[PDB]
Every structure is written in structure tokens, then in C-alpha cells.
Amino acid sequence: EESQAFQRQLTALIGYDVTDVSNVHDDELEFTRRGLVTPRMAEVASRDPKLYAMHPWVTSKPLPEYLWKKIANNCIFIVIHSQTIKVSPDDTPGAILQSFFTQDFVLRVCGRDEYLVGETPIKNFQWVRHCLKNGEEIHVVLDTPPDPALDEVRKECDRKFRVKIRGIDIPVLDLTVFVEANIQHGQQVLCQRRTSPKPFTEEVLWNVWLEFSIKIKDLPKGALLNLQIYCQLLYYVNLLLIDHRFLLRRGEYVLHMWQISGFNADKLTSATNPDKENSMSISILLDNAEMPNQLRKQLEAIIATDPLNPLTAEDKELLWHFRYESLKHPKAYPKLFSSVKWGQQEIVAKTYQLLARREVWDQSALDVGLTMQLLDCNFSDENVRAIAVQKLESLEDDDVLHYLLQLVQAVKFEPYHDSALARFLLKRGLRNKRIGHFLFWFLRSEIAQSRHYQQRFAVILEAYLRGCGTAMLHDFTQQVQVIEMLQKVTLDIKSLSAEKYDVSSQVISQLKQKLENLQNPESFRVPYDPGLKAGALAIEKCKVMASKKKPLWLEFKCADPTALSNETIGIIFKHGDDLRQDMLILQILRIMESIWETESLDLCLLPYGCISTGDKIGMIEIVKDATTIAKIQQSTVGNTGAFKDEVLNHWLKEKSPTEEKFQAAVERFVYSCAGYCVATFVLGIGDRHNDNIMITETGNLFHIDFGHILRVPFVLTPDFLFVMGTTSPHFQKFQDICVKAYLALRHHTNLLIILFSMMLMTGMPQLTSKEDIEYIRDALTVGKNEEDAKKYFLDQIEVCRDKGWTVQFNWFLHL
Ligand SMILES: CN(C)C1CCN(C(=O)c2ccc(NC(=O)Nc3ccc(-c4nc(N5CCOCC5)nc(N5CCOCC5)n4)cc3)cc2)CC1
Numbered sequence: 001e002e003s004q005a006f007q008r009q010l011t012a013l014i015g016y017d018v019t020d021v022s023n024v025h026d027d028e029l030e031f032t033r034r035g036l037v038t039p040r041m042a043e044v045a046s047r048d049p050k051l052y053a054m055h056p057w058v059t060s061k062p063l064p065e066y067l068w069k070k071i072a073n074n075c076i077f078i079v080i081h082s083q084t085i086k087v088s089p090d091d092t093p094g095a096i097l098q099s100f101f102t103q104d105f106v107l108r109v110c111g112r113d114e115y116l117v118g119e120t121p122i123k124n125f126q127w128v129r130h131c132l133k134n135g136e137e138i139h140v141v142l143d144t145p146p147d148p149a150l151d152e153v154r155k156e157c158d159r160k161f162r163v164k165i166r167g168i169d170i171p172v173l174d175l176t177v178f179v180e181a182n183i184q185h186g187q188q189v190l191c192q193r194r195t196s197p198k199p200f201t202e203e204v205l206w207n208v209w210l211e212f213s214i215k216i217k218d219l220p221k222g223a224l225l226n227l228q229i230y231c232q233l234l235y236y237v238n239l240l241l242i243d244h245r246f247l248l249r250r251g252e253y254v255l256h257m258w259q260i261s262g263f264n265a266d267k268l269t270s271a272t273n274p275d276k277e278n279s280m281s282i283s284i285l286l287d288n289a290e291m292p293n294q295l296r297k298q299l300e301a302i303i304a305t306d307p308l309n310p311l312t313a314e315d316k317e318l319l320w321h322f323r324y325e326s327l328k329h330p331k332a333y334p335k336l337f338s339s340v341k342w343g344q345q346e347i348v349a350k351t352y353q354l355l356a357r358r359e360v361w362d363q364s365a366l367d368v369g370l371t372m373q374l375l376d377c378n379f380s381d382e383n384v385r386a387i388a389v390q391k392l393e394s395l396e397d398d399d400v401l402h403y404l405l406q407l408v409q410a411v412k413f414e415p416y417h418d419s420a421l422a423r424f425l426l427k428r429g430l431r432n433k434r435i436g437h438f439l440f441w442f443l444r445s446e447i448a449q450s451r452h453y454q455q456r457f458a459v460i461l462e463a464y465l466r467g468c469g470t471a472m473l474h475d476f477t478q479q480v481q482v483i484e485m486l487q488k489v490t491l492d493i494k495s496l497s498a499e500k501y502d503v504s505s506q507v508i509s510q511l512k513q514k515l516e517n518l519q520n521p522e523s524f525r526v527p528y529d530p531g532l533k534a535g536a537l538a539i540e541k542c543k544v545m546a547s548k549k550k551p552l553w554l555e556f557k558c559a560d561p562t563a564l565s566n567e568t569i570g571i572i573f574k575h576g577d578d579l580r581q582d583m584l585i586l587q588i589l590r591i592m593e594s595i596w597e598t599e600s601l602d603l604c605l606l607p608y609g610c611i612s613t614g615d616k617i618g619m620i621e622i623v624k625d626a627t628t629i630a631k632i633q634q635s636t637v638g639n640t641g642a643f644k645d646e647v648l649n650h651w652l653k654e655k656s657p658t659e660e661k662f663q664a665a666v667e668r669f670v671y672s673c674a675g676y677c678v679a680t681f682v683l684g685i686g687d688r689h690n691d692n693i694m695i696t697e698t699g700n701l702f703h704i705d706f707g708h709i710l711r712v713p714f715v716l717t718p719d720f721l722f723v724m725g726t727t728s729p730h731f732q733k734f735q736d737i738c739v740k741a742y743l744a745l746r747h748h749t750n751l752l753i754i755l756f757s758m759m760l761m762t763g764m765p766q767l768t769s770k771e772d773i774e775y776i777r778d779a780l781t782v783g784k785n786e787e788d789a790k791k792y793f794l795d796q797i798e799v800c801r802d803k804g805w806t807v808q809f810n811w812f813l814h815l
Pocket residue numbers: 572576577578579580581582608620621622623624626628691694704705706707708709710
């Protein structure tokens with residue numbers, strides 16, 4: 001029936017068929033599809049049709065200090081389409097309109113799907129704050145409110161634990177293998193057993209009972225039997241010992257395992273390898289007063305250490321014995337719940353009784369760095385994780401958008417498909433279309449290139465698509481059609497000039513040919529900027545990048561006729577690199593901008609849009625009027641390491657007509673340069689090549705390519721300095737802003753550390769040992785007073801000065 005065709009539509013939008021039961025050994029996934037029906041219908045029935053249709057992008061945070069200095073005498077100007085109007089920062093849009101009349105029309109941004117509606121002061125609209133930040137004019141058309149009808153929804157024992165290892169079987173690959181069974185709880189290995197080593201052949205039968213030290217009723221929920229094969233670790237797979245019904249897992253299992261590549265979130269999945277033809281299989285059978293002062297000081301010191309400082313045994317004993325004292329310190333919760341013997345039923349009982357009375361945690365102000373910690377790989381207990389989700393519930397949509405990528409990623413750490421976190425994401429995406437757009441694209445990113453989690457993520461994405469309404473479904477469908485067309489063009493063009501050729505006649509020929517052939521997809525929403533709709537292509541402006549991986553430089557017209565400007569929307573389509581790394585780094589940069597805003601700073605970061613759409617394939621926003629610092633060098637002294645340091649300021653002058661425009665660009669440059677210095681330093685991506693640093697004609701600096709990130713702490717070359725002048729008066733400004741921004745980030749050390757380690761676990765595999773994570777703790781001068789930290793950053797600046805083009809000259813000889 002047509003219901004089946006609708007499920008087909010959903011499948012095509014998802015990129016995976018959630019009704020497939022070809023790679024399941026239980027009904028957990030379908031159980032979750034069924035359990036999600038209620039949160040979906042409940043948020044749908046709960047949301048306001050009008051605000052959900054117009055999706056006003058609002059914030060309750062106060063107006064920053066740097067935006068106030070840009071205001072007139074309590075007088076924001078709104079150009080309505082077409083007269084200008086004075087308005088008070090605290091003037092509601094409704095009051096604005098009733099003032100403009102002296103009845104039901106709504107103000108929509110010109111050239112955008114963005115609306116200034118709701119009982120919010122224009123002070124508090126992100127588009128208005130963005131216009132103020134960039135000194136643009138709030139241009140609005142008096143449109144008629146979109147029909148909410150277009151959002152309508154298609155209505156829907158004391159025995160010890162034993163595991164029998166029968167054997168392993170592969171048709172692939174003189175070695176020797178043994179099997180290893182672990183009872184794991186949140187990366188805590190409760191107990192461990194091994195089989196004897198038998199020669200590695202395509203079939204190894206043990207028929208061996210591995211008896212564990214843990215008793216059946218001490219198994220905690222969320223505990224995993226982790227089965228691994230060693231020759232080095234060759235393969236792994238995981239089975240939940242308590243399923244989604246709290247039933248002890250019994251029966252026969254034949255689990256197709258994951259292969260290792262010669263620690264990260266894939267090693268945790270409960271999913272089995274779908275590739276049953278080539279993948280290693282394993283076969284198994286289951287059948288079953290108050291403290292003294294010195295101790296107070298020690299406990300406080302422990303609670304004070306950072307999220308990476310590991311807890312010794314005595315530390316955990318102290319935290320557990322004084323658990324009720326520790327419960328008053330919400331900052332101690334991550335460490336307290338790591339001091340819990342989860343393999344002991346009585347201790348987990350005491351732990352739940354502890355969580356029972358948590359008035360201090362409930363009342364505390366939301367601390368995201370703490371919530372995230374509780375949501376990471378070190379916490380399986382769903383009750384421990386549910387309090388983090390509880391705190392998350394109080395985030396406004398603006399903050400949800402700030403943290404949505406890494407919350408979605410954090411879903412990879414949930415033991416079960418249906419989690420508090422999953423339902424929270426579902427709710428927030430259904431309540432608000434901007435969150436829903438990005439939830440769609442993030443879930444789909446992972447569903448398109450992760451067998452390890454595509455099933456769970458596909459269940460969540462289907463749950464979302466069944467409540468977002470048919471309008472947004474049509475939008476997603478158009479977008480997916482367009483992106484698939486364009487990825488087809490990208491790959492087919494990549495095939496045509498594989499290596500060692502810059503650009504051919506035939507190449508540009510075929511590219512323009514296909515783009516002309518493809519345009520006969522009328523209009524689609526820009527995935528990295530859902531307020532922008534792209535129209536026809538500007539075939540004449542589209543080109544093959546002429547990079548190693550020949551990415552596509554495409555440009556579209558804006559489909560919105562109310563659009564004021566005539567600028568095209570530029571998108572780069574790239575295949576060959578894993579752009580999820582870029583998504584993560586850019587999202588951390590956005591969090592850094594947010595942190596800086598809390599302290600009335602603006603470092604003019606340009607976190608360009610970037611959506612990973614598949615396996616080593618994605619799109620990148622084209623910042624208009626931007627060029628590489630390397631290219632500005634080459635243009636005046638081409639193919640030479642001389643790197644004449646006077647050239648950047650000459651270029652700035654050239655592109656800025658008015659000396660005043662030049663000074664504005666120089667100040668923009670001071671700020672954006674300080675911001676990128678601090679950010680790349682903290683993240684350990686500051687030692688980049690001249691070619692991966694771009695600048696807008698208006699002086700805004702910004703880095704690109706966060707996959708190719710490999711000595712110097714960051715890039716502060718003699719040419720940036722010449723744009724500053726070297727001591728000088730603007731270089732003093734640079735150092736001042738840098739110390740301020742660095743200290744501002746050190747004020748959120750914990751959040752930055754948890755986000756960084758999460759990125760390491762969920763982005764690219766690389767090394768991702770403890771060692772990679774520790775660098776950031778170092779760069780944030782953990783356990784240091786702010787004075788020494790400012791000294792540390794100024795020492796980094798001085799190393800930059802001393803090295804000169806040595807760094808850049810070697811980057812040039814190397815590339
Ligand atoms: C160790 N090793 C052997 C490997 C191992 C594995 N591995 C990866 O698998 C991998 C994963 C992710 C990335 N990530 C990535 O590549 N990200 C990106 C790259 C370029 C751009 C760009 N590039 C240009 N061009 C360059 C030159 O001048 C200008 C043109 N322009 C723009 N702009 C957009 C904004 O507006 C202005 C134009 N963006 C934007 C993003 C790379 C590689 C790591 C390396």
C-alpha cells in the first residue's frame with residue numbers, strides 16, 4: 001500500500017533500510033523503532049504549529065559588549081520592503097509591525113528562509129546580532145506567515161557466569177590465535193578469560209567453557225561480553241549480557257566480527273559486521289560522622305583534578321567512602337561514579353540509592369563540560385547518563401545547536417539503541433527545524449559511512465523523519481537528490497584526470513558539459529546553511545579545483561528573488577578525504593567563539609560550513625573573496641621560498657580602496673589572527689602550511705583543511721607581523737587579545753578537554769591513545785596560575801618570531 005511507498009521514501013532519505021533484519025541477533029533495533037513512536041508523537045502534538053513553521057532563531061544570552069558599542073542611541077534600523085524604521089533593541093517584532101502600521105503579516109529576512117517572529121526583543125535574534133556584528137542592514141520583507149498545514153504529519157543466580165566458545169571461522173588469510181572474553185562495563189574490564197592457543201586455520205573449534213569470576217546477579221546492565229581474537233588483536237565483537245528487556249542473554253550466537261586496521265568508538269558497538277561473506281565469525285553459547293580535615297583536603301584535591309587525571313585505587317576508595325560528601329560537589333560526579341565497583345550488585349544498589357537523593361546536582365547550574373563527561377565512553381550505567389541528559393534538557397535551542405554534533409556522536413557511547421540521549425536529540429530536532437535539519441545531516445553522515453553504528457543512527461533518523469512534517473521531508477528529498485547528482489559528477493570527473501595533471505581542456509569541457517546536462521532539481525536548501533536556498537547553477541563559474549583530488553568548485557544563484565545581493569552561493573564538493581574531522585574541528589571552533597562571547601570577545605573566526613555526506617565525500621562552503629596566504633606570496637614572488645614578508649599588507653592595500661577600509665581590514669586581521677593563533681594552539685593544529693591559511697579581502701584570516709594536520713606552536717610569520725609592524729601598537733593589541741582569549745579558554749579547560757577526547761574517539765582513528773589527548777591538557781597549562789599561563793602564551797609568540805620562515809620555508813621544501 002501507499003504506507004509501504006512512504007517507508008520506501010523514508011529509506012531513500014535515510015540511506016539505510018531500518019526494516020531490514022538481515023544483520024540482527026535480536027529485536028533491539030525494532031524494539032527501539034517501537035519505543036520511539038511515543039516521544040515522536042508527543043513532541044509533534046506538543047509543538048506550536050506557527051513557531052515550528054517559522055522557526056525563529058532566538059537566544060536568551062545577553063547582547064554582547066562588542067555589539068552594544070555598535071548600536072546607536074537605543075536605535076536599531078530595520079529596512080522593511082521599502083522604508084527604513086528606527087526601533088528599540090527591546091522592541092518585539094509584533095510591536096515593530098504594529099508601529100509600522102500606525103495586521104497578521106510577518107517580517108522575513110530578505111533572500112532567506114528566516115523570520116523575525118515571537119515575543120523576543122530584536123536584541124535577541126541571531127540574524128540581527130549577525131547583522132550588527134558584520135555592520136550590515138537588517139533588510140526584511142513584510143511577507144505572509146507560512147501555512148502550518150504544510151508541516152502536517154502522516155499519522156502513525158549465584159552461579160558464576162560462563163560462556164561457551166565453540167569456535168571461529170573465516171575463509172580468508174603459519175600463525176596462532178586465541179580468543180579473549182571480557183566482561184566490560186564502560187571500558188572497565190570486570191573480569192577476563194582466554195582460550196588456549198590453537199593454530200590459525202579457517203576453522204578453529206574450542207568447545208570450551210570459559211568460566212568468569214563474576215556471579216550472574218552481579219552483572220550490571222549495559223555490561224558487554226567483548227570477544228576478541230589474538231594472533232596482536234585481529235578481530236573483535238560485542239554482545240550485551242543484559243538486553244533491552246533486562247533479560248539475561250541466552251542461546252546460541254554466531255557473531256560476525258569487525259577486523260582491526262594496522263581506543264575509538266567503533267570498538268564499542270553492539271552491531272555485528274554485515275559482511276557475512278568475508279568477515280571472521282565467532283560462535284558461542286550462553287545458558288545460565290563527617291570527615292577529618294586532612295581527608296576533606298585530599299577529597300577536594302581529587303575532585304579538583306582535570307578529566308584526564310586518572311584516579312588511583314586509594315583515590316577511588318576515598319571517593320566511595322565519602323560518596324555522600326562527594327555528592328555535594330557536582331564537579332566530583334564524573335570521578336565519583338568512576339569509583340563504583342559496577343561488578344558488584346550491592347555496590348550498584350548503594351549507587352542508585354545515592355543518585356536517588358541528588359538535590360545538589362538537580363539544583364546546580366548546567367555545566368556542559370560535566371554533562372559531556374558523564375555522556376562519554378567511561379559511563380555505561382544508563383541512570384548515571386540520564387542525569388547528564390537531565391541537565392541537557394535545560395539548554396536553549398541555540399546551545400543545542402552549539403553542541404549537537406558531539407551529542408549525536410556521543411550516541412555512539414550509549415550501550416543501548418534507545419537511550420535518554422537518543423530521545424533527547426529526537427525531541428529537540430522535532431521541536432525546532434534548524435536543529436532538525438542539522439540532526440538529519442549529522443545522522444545521515446554517520447549512516448552513510450559507518451557500519452558500526454548505521455543501524456542505530458538509522459533508527460533514530462527514521463524516528464525523526466516520521467515527525468518533522470511533509471514540508472521538511474520534501475526539503476530533505478530535494479537536498480539529497482541534488483547532493484547525489486553532484487557527488488556523481490564529482491567522482492566521474494575525478495576519474496578523468498587521476499594524477500599528475502593540473503587541468504585539461506577536456507576536463508573543463510566535460511565538467512561544464514555535465515553541469516549543463518544536469519540542469520535539465522529546481523531549487524534546494526543549502527545543507528550547511530538551511531536559511532539559504534540555491535537555484536540554477538552558474539555553469540560559467542564552476543570549475544575543477546585543480547587539487548590533488550580534483551574537487552569541484554560549484555556556484556549557484558540564490559533561488560530567493562527577495563535576495564538583495566547578486567552573489568552566488570559557492571560550494572566545494574570533495575571526494576578523497578574524511579570531512580567528519582573538519583566538521584568536528586569547526587564545531588569546536590564554534591564552541592570557542594561561544595566561550596569568547598561569554599567574556600565579551602570576538603576573534604572573527606570563519607568556521608566555514610562543512611557537511612560530510614558520505615564515505616570520504618562532502619561539501620564545503622566557499623568563503624567569498626578569500627585567497628591563500630601562500631598564493632598572495634606566490635603572486636609577487638612565485639615558486640620561491642624567499643617569502644617576502646612585505647607582500648600581505650601590499651595585497652590588503654590593493655584590495656581595500658579606502659585607507660579606512662584598509663585599517664578596518666587590519667583590525668579584523670589582528671583579531672582573527674589572534675583567534676586562530678589561540679585556537680590552533682589549544683587544539684595542536686597551529687603548525688600549518690601557508691597554503692592552508694586563507695584571508696578575506698577584508699582582512700579576516702582563517703584556516704582550512706583540518707585533516708592534513710601533520711616545529712612551531714602556531715603560524716605567526718614575519719608577513720603577518722609586517723601587517724602588524726615589527727614591537728608596534730597593533731602587535732601589543734595582538735598579544736593582549738591572545739592572552740585574554742587563551743585565559744578565557746582555560747576557564748573552560750574541562751569542556752575543551754572532554755570535547756577534544758570525544759573528537760579523538762569519534763572522528764578519525766589515527767592513533768587515539770592517551771598520549772594524543774594529553775597535548776591539550778599541556779597547552780591549557782593545567783594546574784597553573786593565570787600569570788604563568790600568559791607567560792607561556794607569550795613564549796609561544798616569541799618562538800613564532802624566532803623561527804621566521806624556517807617553518808614556512810620547510811613547509812615549502814616539503815610541499
Ligand atoms: C596523514 N595523511 C597521509 C592523511 C592520512 C588520512 N587523512 C584523511 O583522510 C583526511 C581527512 C580530512 C581532511 N580534511 C580536508 O581536507 N578539509 C578541507 C580541505 C581543503 C579545503 C579548502 N581548500 C581550498 N583550496 C586550497 C588552495 O587554495 C584555495 C583552494 N579552498 C577552500 N575554501 C573554502 C572556504 O572558502 C574559500 C575556499 N577550502 C577545505 C577543507 C583531509 C584528509 C589525513 C591525511
